[PDB]
């Protein structure tokens, strides 16, 4: 399964979570930004690696980073 | 009327009930074939399949081989027969290795029920799972299937060679 990391540059704009096609990211409470929220990656087993999450990231060099790793039938997007 | 409907009333299968997949002709024709004919041991299925396959396999090798003859030649017939037999040997090798790497069962249609009843808390894929309930889906069943395919292929190739010689000589 791929690896997804969140960095404290998160501004809690939720654009990553609402762009994930496989429900990998979610918004959790935080105290490091104005919005009081930070993205989390608790379901990386469903991560497919499409990187839509970091295409919607407005922070300078990203706050969500997807590191491709071992492959799985879920991560390979295999309907068969 | 509509002649295409979801297969077995399941609209989510990747299949359809067309006048070809589920027609009475298709049903009977596939049920008379050796692979699906009822009352056949795996050895018998293999033997019939091998006979038919060697019988029609000697044809192209003898007719279009490297040693053809517009007249009848014993050398051409021998070349075609040997090529067909070696191709059957290659196919039997493929069958043997496929069965070796595919199944780990010696008696099917039971192990599935045993693990659906007496629990299967093991390494799985041998107790649980098990795709298919046919006797062809076992280590023993596939071994006898390959043996029958190989023997029947030899016999059918020889029979077809004899028939070809008779047709070319007496006609």
């Amino acid at each position: 399964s791929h690896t997804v990391k969140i960095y404290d540059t998160c501004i809690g704009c939720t654009q990553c979570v609402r762009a994930c096609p496989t429900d990998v990211l979610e918004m959790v409470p935080w105290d490091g930004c104005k919005a009081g929220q930070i993205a989390s990656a608790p379901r990386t087993e469903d991560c497919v690696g499409c990187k839509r999450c970091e295409t919607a990231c407005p922070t300078d060099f990203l706050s969500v980073r997807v590191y491709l790793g071992g492959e799985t039938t879920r991560s390979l997007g295999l309907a068969y | 009327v509509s002649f295409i409907k979801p297969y077995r009333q399941d609209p989510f299968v990747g299949h359809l009930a067309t006048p070809i997949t589920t027609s009475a002709f298709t049903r009977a024709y596939l049920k008379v074939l050796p692979a699906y004919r009822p009352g056949l041991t795996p050895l018998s299925r293999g033997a019939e399949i091998g006979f038919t396959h060697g019988y029609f396999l000697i044809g192209p090798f003898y007719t279009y081989g490297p040693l053809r003859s517009v007249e009848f030649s014993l050398t051409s017939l021998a070349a075609g027969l040997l090529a067909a037999i070696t191709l059957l040997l290659i196919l039997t090798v493929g069958l043997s290795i496929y069965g070796q790497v595919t199944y780990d069962v010696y008696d099917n249609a039971l192990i599935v029920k045993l693990v659906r009843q007496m629990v299967g808390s093991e390494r799985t894929q041998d107790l649980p799972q098990i795709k298919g309930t046919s006797e062809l889906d076992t280590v023993l069943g596939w071994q006898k299937f390959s043996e029958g395919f190989f023997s029947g292929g030899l016999i059918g190739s020889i029979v077809a060679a004899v028939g070809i010689a008779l047709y070319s000589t007496y006609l």
Binding site: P21, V48, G49, C50, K51, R52, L68, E71, S75, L76, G77, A79, Y80 | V1, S2, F3, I4, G14, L16
Partner: protein, 739 residues
């Protein structure tokens, strides 16, 4: 306040000319990177994203059609002007069989005057392969003054079409209901446009082209031929050549149409003097076509209680296997310009290819069959246009599926049912493509390896394992027996290609029976295989344009997008555009093979010279039958052999063909930089170049960005097509002009 048009919808102003990208909501803000410049031209004619109203899109399309027709009229006016002023048409008229048509002279600069060839008739210029001289002769044009007046009329018509486009966008723009009168539009295009054009052309042929060309074939010089208007004012100048005009129009109105058999014939074959179709046959053909199309125009109900409704016709064509049938197709084709473009472009390209075939098969112009460069150029050009138009039709079908397809409006109709089993279609088409390619090409490779191994009796040749195209030979036999048996009123077969005598004009073969052997079997199956693979790519693009097992929401990404990401193992080129890109490549392959087959087969087994005793000697000598069955044969006896004229053209009047040969090779190889590479590399190289510019304080404000992935693919395919087609263009033209 008319019910069909809106008056003064858009003000005629130059203000928006000074605001580039005003049409697009995204481009209107102004450029920030160089991507804006490329996006400006890529969205110029995408009127769907510029307005949200079908009416505005329709009006823009209508005015764009007017602009295109004005451009076409300007091009035709230029052609006629060049024929009038910079051509040897008058000299070619007096010696069609010994003077090469030329209509473009080259200025004497930088030594380029060598391009002015010895075309004959005391003229120097570039030999013309568009066949305008033969067309003008068939029109009865015997003077360059008539060409000048046709050019002036073309200029006037081009201005008229420009004014019409301006008028119908800015002064009186038609409403949506006017555009959606498909019944009225079909009635008019079938009766008025097609039928009345055929009728008017039949009238022109009968009254101008029939007498003038008959006098020309009789040997009368163009100077003593009467002016065309005199054939109308004087019923005695035409009644001598065709002694049936003496009865006037009375036989027509008295149903005694047999009297007009003098100039309305049904002969078939070719004119023995000119080698083209009998112009009496052509006039009769156009008359029959006019009547048929006028009749066909009275079919659809427009404004009276009479005719058909296309909605009622389509909705009644259901079936057990097709569910709702054609229900909803009328709404699809009356609310989506892209669907209409798909159908029209596909059928238009197919029509162009059919035209290309029927052109050389039955030469319709005087002294055009013996002008081999003209025949080769016309066939190749029309087949190329047909292939491009077919790929465009597939592209716009995919665009309709992505954009204008409504799932709710197409419940259980034909479109829905096709998408529901797209897998089966694509898988079986894949199997057919593999079968056809394996067979055709592997038979070619088997022939090649048997020849390389010294086993000549193991080939798929005529003197070996033979694959006779018996079905095509049966059809050829049926056509050569048609006159008197199935076409009892015919005097000769439609084309001598099906069989018959060798038709020669001035010792040059015009047409001759095209024998079909095992060599034609293999190349025909190659054609079928290439066509099937192109259809596979385009149909996979159209059917999987909305969704797939990979990307279930591919329609939300649009018609034109590079990918969905490196995930799923990699989702490159999943668009539908990336399928029109690959299909363009495969169309190039297929059309190149088709034109190669045509060129070699014609040069080897049709074209040539006929000895006075009747011995036929061809351009190459019949090497197609035995040497076109191996890839080495195609490489050596066709490519290497017939490329001799291109490579040895330096210093001669054909040197421009060698230069274009080299330049097209250069462009084709240039394409591979865009086709093989990716953006990350070019963007990161532009980074260092921008660093240098910033170091020298010369970095542009418009930030330079590497071409987008889709634009990189588009540039690659455009350069590939240009280079390959130009290489074949120069090769064909130099070879067929030299010999």
């Amino acid at each position: 306040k008319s019910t069909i048009v809106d008056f003064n919808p858009v003000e005629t102003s130059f203000e928006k000319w000074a605001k580039p990208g005003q049409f697009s909501r995204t481009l209107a803000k102004g450029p920030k990177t160089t991507t804006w410049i490329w996006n400006l031209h890529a969205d110029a004619h995408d009127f769907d994203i510029q307005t949200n109203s079908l009416q505005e899109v329709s009006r823009k399309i209508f005015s764009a059609h007017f602009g295109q027709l004005a451009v076409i009229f300007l091009w035709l006016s230029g052609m006629h002007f060049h024929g009038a002023y910079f051509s040897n048409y008058s000299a070619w008229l007096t010696n069609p069989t010994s003077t090469k048509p030329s209509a473009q002279i080259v200025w004497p600069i930088v030594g380029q005057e060598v391009l002015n060839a010895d075309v004959g008739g005391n003229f120097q210029g570039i030999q013309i392969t568009s066949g305008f001289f033969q067309l003008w002769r068939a029109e009865g044009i015997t003077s360059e003054v008539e060409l000048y007046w046709t050019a002036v009329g073309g200029l006037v018509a081009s201005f008229l079409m420009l004014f019409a486009g301006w008028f119908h966008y800015h002064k009186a723009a038609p409403k949506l209901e006017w555009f959606q009168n498909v019944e009225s539009m079909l009635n008019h295009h079938l009766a008025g446009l097609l039928g009345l054009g055929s009728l008017s052309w039949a009238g022109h042929q009968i009254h101008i082209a029939l007498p003038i060309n008959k006098l020309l074939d009789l040997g009368v010089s163009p100077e003593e031929i009467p002016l065309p208007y005199e054939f109308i004012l004087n019923r005695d100048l035409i009644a001598q050549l065709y002694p049936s005009f003496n009865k006037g129009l009375t036989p027509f109105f008295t149903l005694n149409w047999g009297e007009y058999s003098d100039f309305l014939t049904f002969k078939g074959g070719l004119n023995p003097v000119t080698g083209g179709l009998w112009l009496t046959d052509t006039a009769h053909h156009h008359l029959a076509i006019a009547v048929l199309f006028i009749v066909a125009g009275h079919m659809y109900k427009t404004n009276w209680f009479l005719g058909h409704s296309i909605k009622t016709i389509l909705e009644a064509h259901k079936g057990p296997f097709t569910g709702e049938g054609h229900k909803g197709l009328y709404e699809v084709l009356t609310t989506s310009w892209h669907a209409q473009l798909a159908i029209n472009l596909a059928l238009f390209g197919s029509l162009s290819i059919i035209v290309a075939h029927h052109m050389y098969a039955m030469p319709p112009y005087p002294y055009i069959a013996i002008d081999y460069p003209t025949q080769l150029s016309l066939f190749t050009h029309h087949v190329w246009i047909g292939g491009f138009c077919i790929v465009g039709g597939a592209a716009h079908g995919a665009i309709f599926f992505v954009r204008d397809y409504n799932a709710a409006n197409n419940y259980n109709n034909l479109i829905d049912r096709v998408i529901r089993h797209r897998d089966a279609i694509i898988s079986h088409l894949n199997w057919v493509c593999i079968f056809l390619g394996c067979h055709s090409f592997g038979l070619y490779v088997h022939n090649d390896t048997m020849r390389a191994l010294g086993r000549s009796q193991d080939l798929f040749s005529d003197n070996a394992i033979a694959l006779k195209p018996i079905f095509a030979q049966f059809i050829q036999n049926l056509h050569t027996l048609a006159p008197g048996s199935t076409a009892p009123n015919a005097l000769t077969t439609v084309s001598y290609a099906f069989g018959g005598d060798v038709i020669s004009v001035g010792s040059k073969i015009a047409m001759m029976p095209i024998s079909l052997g095992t060599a034609d079997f293999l190349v025909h199956h190659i054609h079928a295989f290439t066509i099937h693979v192109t259809v596979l790519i385009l149909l996979k693009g159209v059917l999987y344009s909305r969704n797939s097992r990979l990307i279930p929401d591919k329609a939300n990404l649009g018609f034109r997008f590079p990918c969905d990401g490196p995930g799923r193992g990699g989702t490159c080129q999943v668009s539908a555009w990336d399928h029109v890109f690959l299909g363009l490549f495969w169309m190039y392959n297929s059309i190149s093979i088709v034109i190669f087959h045509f060129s070699w087969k014609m040069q080897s087994d049709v074209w040539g010279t006929v000895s006075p005793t009747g011995a036929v000697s061809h351009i190459t000598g019949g090497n197609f039958a035995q040497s076109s069955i191996t890839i080495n044969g195609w490489l050596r006896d066709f490519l290497w052999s017939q490329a001799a004229q291109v490579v040895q053209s330096y210093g001669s009047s054909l040197s421009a063909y060698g230069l274009i040969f080299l330049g097209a090779h250069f462009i084709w190889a240039f394409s591979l930089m865009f086709l093989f590479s990716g953006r990350g590399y070019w963007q990161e190289l532009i980074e260092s170049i921008v660093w240098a510019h910033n170091k020298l304080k010369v970095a542009p404000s418009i930030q330079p960005r590497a071409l987008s992935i889709t634009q990189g693919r588009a540039v690659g395919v455009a350069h590939y097509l240009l280079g390959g087609i130009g290489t074949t263009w120069a090769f064909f033209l130099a070879r067929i002009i030299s010999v």
